[PDB]
Amino acid sequence: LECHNQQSSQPPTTKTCSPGETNCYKKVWRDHRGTIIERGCGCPTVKPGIKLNCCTTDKCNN
């Protein structure tokens, strides 16, 4: 599996996940810096204050 890994509004990039990984994630929240989006491999738990999407196809987390 490859997923997108760039932050926020930066130009899209990608990485290959570790073997066995079937998830990509995108995670959006606000803090003192502004709005942050983090993208990568896997899928963390749902947390208050964070909008999370996890998807299972190449480059889906754009």
Structural commentary:
The chain has 62 residues and is mostly beta strands. The chain has one domain (1-62): Ribbon (CD59). Helix content is 0%, strand content 44%. The strands form two sheets. Strands 4-3-5 form a three-stranded antiparallel sheet, with no helix packed on it. The protein is globular, with a radius of gyration of 11 Å. 10% of the residues are buried.
Determine Rg (CA atoms, Å).
11 Å
Output the CATH homologous superfamily.
Answer: CD59
Strand order of the largest sheet: 4-3-5
- Describe the global form: globular
Largest sheet: 3 strands, antiparallel
Structural class: mainly beta
> In CATH terms, what is the fold-level topology?
CD59
Distance between the termini: 14 Å
The proportion of residues forming helix, as a percent range, comes to under 10%
Would you spell out the secondary-structure blueprint of this structure?
Elements: E1 2-4, E2 14-16, E3 24-31, E4 34-41, E5 51-55
Antiparallel strand pairs: 1-2, 3-4, 3-5
Characteristics:
globular; three-stranded antiparallel sheet; 44% strand; 62 residues; neurotoxin; 5 strands; mainly beta; CD59; 0% helix; two-stranded antiparallel sheet
Short structural summary:
The protein is mostly beta strands and 62 residues long.
